[PDB]
């Protein structure tokens, strides 16, 4: 009496992965390639739907990571390769209007550079930071990337502003947006909605802290695989952002040196006025309140009566031990020891020392660096902290106290805090069900 | 009365050419880029059908040749380019524990090379063979590629092992596999089968000897486009493999020279043992019985009572006169005059071998690759599964036939593997009359 009927277009999805395409409203990320995004993003709420999500097993973070790396490598291709810059550098210390904090940080180098004519050289000079040069034993110096890999110089016409990009699913696929509040990294979501494209995600590269990210809806959320594992990083999301102001009062000057036919090297000229160390300011009251909220959530996860102690980074490279910035064109490396220094039981601002490096390896890759050319004028970087990347130590059987230190070593954690609400599924329109619908000859 | 009917999905195919994607279970051929092969390759045996095959007119050979050339050119692009090496090389002979056969083959050159700094230069030493070194002033030598093209140093992390690759036809196309023995490569095949992918085709590069190939099923098979034509190479397939042991007991040492910022040049540092010439060992018993089977199959086509002689290569370049191949990474050029030296009527053979670093693969001009030296003793074992012979004419043939090895192009080497495959285009649309009238 029952015949298996065939239905097409049934609302059935299957968890899988695919190659998503970008959408935006030149930059390094080539948002000019991302297709346009309609001004009316469709968002249909799915009542009575309980879908299981997973932050760590999500494939969107890996795809976006590969896309960002590919866009960076493609953007550095039409620029100037700084291969003849690796020469013998005769550097001297810059003691003109220097401060006590900047003693030895900036070095005034002089070297023989090539000209447009292959039969003659030129005597030019430039200012390099201490982190960009190394002695080969005035003294003879050499860039730190000469013995590893000669890299290209970043094009000044191309900016590093992390404008948001929207990841959209192709035909036959859908993106499930979890609108449930107080939702951690895993577990089922009782409020799932569908969207054709994700929200505006800014590809901001940062270490130990999250900048210009998405804020929490109601309270501070602590996300990790499980708190029993110390090797897994702890992702924190703030509900109220705290303002952070980074700047450099040096007022640098850009000097153009034509090293060859059609290519030029943007060197650093003389410093205007006094030289002061780059710093960053964080409000003391807001940071204390945010640390109190984070301590409350960590106590809720680890049990009450725990002495939550915050410590600075343990050790390692400068990229994992310092906070990395990217705004205007100069890459910063700020010492965040003043923020993570407290102990919790039961107009003032924090000035953090900061350093600037020109030759960087932000993707933690050996053999492909990038030279950031200097920019003129005083840089004023104003942003807000929306999260942290903490790491807990062992602590042994002593559960009366726990030490939390900033973490890093993986850029995927920065984008994981933004893609926690999305998931890619495969729409399955074919379905079979019995009905009294039978064919007739 | 009969009315036409439309049938969709009929088993009808037509010969056509297509772009066959590969299939495979860090590498030059980029095996990681290929799709994963089927763990259970389905092979449907087609009964009562006879399909005409053509070994010499197969488009898969040309497609494979272009694919191997493209992969070879793409694999050399992400590593070091050796343009800075065309300089005056003050060289001299090695003469340290040489063995008379290697008197001037190895040379100890010295030259001025750049360093990590653009304005700093240095003097380094390197061991270069006489094959890739030419005198520029009649003690001052230079590389043979200095007046041809700047060679590209091969990537040291990328291996040259010919791992098998499977060629698969896309949707709407099929590969017909002829499972009939005694096939000479041309003509109809009374036993064909449909396969979605071919078997393991190892892209082994070899001249005058088919190494690591597919053996015959019953007896030695001899295939040629025209037996009576001397310009057509004769392809022989063995039913049993002939083991060959090639080695290099020099025990070279590899050192890295900072050719520039971020790039290093791998040069032969020094020898820490007795310098001996490379050689390959082939047992004369198996080679004798194999040549007996070959001469029997040759007499099967050229008639009885005629004598057949085997001579070495006539002359020309070293790539066509010597058996060139790859063994562990280093490129060998062995003299096979000892193998093809006999006359038929009615221990181990030690073949002298030479090693060259600057090579011009695929017989191209303007594109060369420098093979970096490999430390340690290189030894490999291969299977001689076939030969590429060449015949010459004479006045009334004088009841004699002379066969010499043929250093042809790489298409003939891969043709011995794709001899039982062809590509057909499926035509599912068909019409036939039936006593059926559609209603109105």
């Amino acid at each position, epitope marked *: 009496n029952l015949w298996v009927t065939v239905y097409y277009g049934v609302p059935v999805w299957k968890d899988a992965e695919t190659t998503l395409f970008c959408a935006s409203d030149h930059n390094v990320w080539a948002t000019h390639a991302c297709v346009p995004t309609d001004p009316n993003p469709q968002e249909i709420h799915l009542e009575n739907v309980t879908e299981e999500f997973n932050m760590w097993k999500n494939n969107m973070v890996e795809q976006m990571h590969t896309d960002i790396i590919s866009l960076w490598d493609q953007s550095l291709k039409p620029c100037v390769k700084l291969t003849p810059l690796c020469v013998t550098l005769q550097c001297t210390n810059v003691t003109n209007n220097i401060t006590d904090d900047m003693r030895g940080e900036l070095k005034n180098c002089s070297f*023989n550079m090539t000209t447009e004519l292959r039969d003659k050289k030129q005597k030019v000079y430039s200012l390099f930071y201490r982190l960009d040069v190394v002695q080969i*034993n005035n003294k003879e110096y050499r860039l730190i990337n000469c013995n590893t890999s000669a890299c290209t110089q970043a094009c000044p016409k191309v900016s590093f502003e992390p404008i948001p990009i929207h990841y959209c699913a192709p035909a036959g696929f859908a993106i499930l947006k979890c609108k449930d509040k107080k939702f951690n990294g895993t577990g089922p979501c009782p409020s799932v909605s569908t969207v054709q494209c994700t929200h505006g995600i800014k590809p901001v590269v940062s270490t130990q802290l999250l900048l210009n990210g998405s804020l929490a809806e109601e309270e501070v959320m602590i996300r990790s695989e499980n708190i029993t594992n110390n090797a897994k990083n702890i992702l924190v999301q703030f509900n109220t952002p705290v303002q952070i102001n980074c700047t450099r009062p040096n007022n640098n000057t850009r000097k153009s040196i034509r090293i060859g036919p059609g290519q030029a090297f943007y060197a650093t000229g003389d410093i205007i006025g006094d030289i002061r160390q780059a710093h960053c300011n964080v409000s003391k009251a807001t940071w204390n309140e945010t640390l109190g909220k984070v301590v409350k959530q960590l106590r809720k996860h680890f049990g009450n009566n725990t002495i939550i102690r915050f410590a600075n980074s343990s050790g390692g490279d400068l990229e994992v031990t310092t906070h990395s910035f990217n705004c205007g064109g100069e890459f910063f490396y700020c010492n965040t020891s003043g923020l993570f220094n407290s102990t919790w039981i039961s107009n003032d601002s924090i000035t953090l020392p900061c350093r600037i490096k020109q030759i960087i390896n932000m993707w933690q890759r050996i053999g492909q660096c990038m030279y950031a050319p200097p920019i003129q004028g005083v840089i004023r970087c104003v942003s807000n902290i929306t999260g942290l990347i903490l790491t807990r130590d062992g602590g042994s059987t002593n559960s009366t106290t726990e030490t939390f230190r900033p973490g890093g070593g993986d850029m995927r954690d920065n984008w994981r805090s933004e893609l926690y609400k999305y998931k890619v599924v495969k729409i399955e329109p074919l379905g079979v069900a019995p009905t009294r619908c039978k064919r007739r000859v | 009365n009969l009315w036409v009917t439309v049938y969709y999905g009929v088993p009808v195919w037509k010969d056509a050419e297509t772009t066959l994607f590969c299939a495979s279970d860090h590498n030059v051929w980029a095996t990681h880029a290929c799709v994963p092969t089927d763990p259970n390759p389905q092979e449907i045996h087609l009964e009562n059908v006879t399909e005409e095959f053509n070994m010499w007119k197969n488009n898969m050979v040309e497609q494979m040749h272009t694919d191997i050339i493209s992969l070879w050119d793409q694999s050399l692009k992400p590593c070091v380019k050796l343009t800075p090496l065309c300089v005056t090389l003050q060289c*001299t002979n090695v003469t340290n524990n040489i063995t008379d056969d290697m008197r001037g083959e190895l040379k100890n050159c*010295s030259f001025n090379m750049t360093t990590e700094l653009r304005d*700093k*230069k240095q*003097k380094v030493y390197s061991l270069f063979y006489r094959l890739d070194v030419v005198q520029i002033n009649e*003690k001052e030598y230079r590389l043979i590629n200095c007046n041809t093209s700047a060679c590209t140093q091969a990537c040291p992390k990328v291996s040259f092992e010919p791992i098998p690759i499977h060629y698969c036809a896309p949707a709407g196309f099929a590969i017909l596999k002829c499972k009939d023995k005694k096939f000479n490569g041309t003509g109809p095949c009374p036993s064909v089968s449909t396969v979605q992918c071919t078997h393991g085709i190892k892209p082994v590069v070899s001249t005058q000897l088919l190494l690591n190939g597919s053996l015959a099923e019953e007896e030695v098979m001899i295939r040629s486009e025209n037996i009576t034509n001397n310009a057509k190479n004769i392809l022989v397939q063995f039913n049993t493999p002939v083991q060959i042991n090639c080695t290099r007991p020099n025990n070279n040492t590899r050192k890295s020279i900072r050719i520039g910022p971020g790039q290093a040049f791998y040069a032969t540092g020094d020898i820490i043992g007795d310098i001996r010439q490379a050689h390959c060992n082939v047992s004369k018993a198996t080679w004798n019985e194999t040549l007996g089977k070959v001469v029997k199959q040759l007499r099967k086509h050229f008639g009885n009572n005629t004598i057949i002689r085997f001579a070495n290569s006539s002359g020309g370049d070293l790539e066509v006169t010597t058996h060139s191949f790859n063994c562990g990474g280093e490129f060998f050029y062995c003299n096979t005059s000892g193998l093809f030296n006999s006359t038929w009527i009615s221990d181990s053979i030690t073949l002298p071998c030479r090693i060259k670093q600057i090579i011009n693969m695929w017989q191209r001009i303007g594109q060369c690759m420098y093979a970096p030296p490999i430390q340690g003793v290189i030894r490999c074992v291969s299977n001689i599964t076939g030969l590429i012979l060449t015949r010459d004419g004479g006045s009334t043939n004088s009841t004699t036939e002379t066969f010499r090895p043929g250093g042809g192009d790489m298409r003939d080497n891969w043709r011995s593997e794709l001899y039982k495959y062809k590509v057909v285009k499926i035509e599912p649309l068909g019409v036939a009359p039936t006593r059926c009238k559609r209603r109105v």
Partner: antibody, heavy 133, light 107 residues
């Protein structure tokens, strides 16, 4: 311009360690230079002993003084020393501490810093030694 | 007996030209520069010719040096009375990793 003076023991008994000290005045222990020691016996020619790099701690010695000579460098007080263990009666020679420039500039804009262009420009005043009772 | 073969002595009158030869191997002369030194009894040796063709500071125009592959030579044009000294040819040996002086040509 640059003066080099050396001092040591004029009479040394057989079988102990012979120590020689040479100092630099007007210059510095830095740059592309090779601080070497050269001695010559009466009736024999100049014989090289060893060397020490100015910008590195590496050193090389003559094979005739296999595992018998040692040369140290102290860049703090700009001095380099020479030590010869188990002095025999064949060591009576006038020891000279010399500086060997290894810098060379070709016709182009390149430069070389290696032992290929080694040449001893300056020499010490020379100190004689006697190996007897 | 040793590297850097040089004749034990040379005798020639004044006002004319004399040549002192010095030959070695490929590792010492063929790939490294040859240096000439002059030594008098009682004083320290002095550098005469360096880089096979460059004259040291304070050296008269009469001294001249040249190198031809494996062999090297020192030319003394218009010999004088105070030229009676010991001339040593030195170069670096890449095979033995060390500086080696000649046998010493007594003029």
């Amino acid at each position: 311009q640059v003066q080099l003076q050396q001092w040591g023991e004029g009479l040394v008994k057989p079988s102990e360690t012979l120590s020689l000290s040479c100092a630099v005045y007007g210059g510095s222990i830095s740059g592309h230079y090779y601080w070497s020691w050269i001695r010559q016996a009466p009736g024999k020619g100049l014989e090289w002993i060893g060397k020490i790099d100015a910008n590195s701690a590496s050193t090389n010695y003559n094979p005739s003084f296999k595992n018998r000579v040692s040369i140290s460098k102290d860049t703090s007080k700009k001095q380099f020393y020479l030590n010869l263990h188990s002095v025999t009666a064949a060591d009576t020679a006038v020891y000279y501490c010399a500086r060997g420039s290894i810098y060379y500039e070709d016709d182009d804009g390149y430069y070389y810093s290696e032992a290929t262009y080694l040449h001893l420009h300056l020499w010490g005043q020379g100190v004689v030694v006697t190996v007897s009772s | 007996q040793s590297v850097l073969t040089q004749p034990p002595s040379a005798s020639e009158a004044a006002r004319k030209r004399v040549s002192i030869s010095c030959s070695g191997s490929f590792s010492n002369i063929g790939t490294n520069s040859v240096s000439w030194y002059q030594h008098l009894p009682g004083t320290a040796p002095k550098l005469l010719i360096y880089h096979n063709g460059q004259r040291a500071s304070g050296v008269s125009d009469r001294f001249s040096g040249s190198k031809s592959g494996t062999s090297a030579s020192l030319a003394i044009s218009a010999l004088q009375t105070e030229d009676e000294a010991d001339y040593y040819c030195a170069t670096w040996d890449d095979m033995l990793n060390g500086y080696f002086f000649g046998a010493g040509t007594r003029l």
